[PDB]
């Protein structure tokens, strides 16, 4: 039900979303650390600086600075670039970050995973 | 294709304990483009896995020139217009490289496998010759 729109997995089968099933019907703000837990498997959270954009009906921006989370307000980028997605795959090969001129990233990957950086400037 | 004088890499820098470090070749008179860009790739290969990475090299020698390094295979990129004119603080002395900084654009993404737990830093520029966002 809840998914990231600015970070994706690179896999042998294609692009895979970070998605969490909202069982308790909580809010984006209350489940953000679950996304960080998911990314924790592929990058070093305590050494990385990056933003998390969560789509939950509306869009909610967050910054993760070495594990510390903050709410981001004045951002209006539309991560609506038509992308093709899959869900099944065998192995992860990289982590894909959609960056913007106001939302850079600093990533230290795990297990020789690749860091992919793609730019959007729409709104 | 040939150049003369100093050539600077303007979209890739080292992140070090002392700050940002620039790659430059001080004399390029008789050397051709493929040899010049190869030298930058060789320098970068100490910090990233060239055979698995895909990125762009933007160099400035009077004019701006664009190249793509796809798993070690270098190609010239035509019809690019990003100017990479953001003023930046550089240093030349350092003791430890902690990451590689990539200035990426809508047309020039990057796929980087770093070495030695080095960080990958990605910063966007949107400034172009003619779009009215540079300078």
From TrEMBL, chain B:
Just give the chief location class. Answer: virion
Read off the Pfam families from this record.
Chordopox_E11 (PF06138)
Q: Which organism is it from?
A: Vaccinia virus (strain LC16m0) (VACV)
Going by the UniProt record, its keywords in alphabetical order are: Virion
Q: GO terms for CC? A: virion component
Cross-referenced InterPro entries? Virion_core
Q: Where in the cell is it found?
A: Virion
Family under the similarity heading: Belongs to the orthopoxvirus OPG073 family.
Superkingdom in the source lineage: Viruses
**Protein known as:** Core protein OPG073
């Amino acid at each position: 039900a809840m998914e990231l729109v600015n970070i994706f997995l690179e896999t042998d089968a294609g692009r895979v979303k970070f998605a969490i099933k909202n069982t308790d019907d909580v809010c984006a703000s209350e489940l953000i650390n679950k996304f960080v837990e998911l990314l924790s498997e592929y990058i070093h959270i305590d050494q990385s600086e990056f933003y998390l954009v969560v789509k939950d009906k509306d869009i909610f921006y967050f910054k993760c600075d070495r594990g510390s989370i903050s709410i981001v307000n004045n951002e209006f980028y539309v991560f609506d670039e038509p992308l093709l997605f899959v869900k099944d795959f065998t192995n992860v090969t990289g982590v894909e970050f959609i960056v913007t001129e106001t939302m850079p990233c600093r990533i230290i990957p795990k297990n020789n995973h690749a860091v992919i950086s793609v730019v959007t400037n729409h709104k």
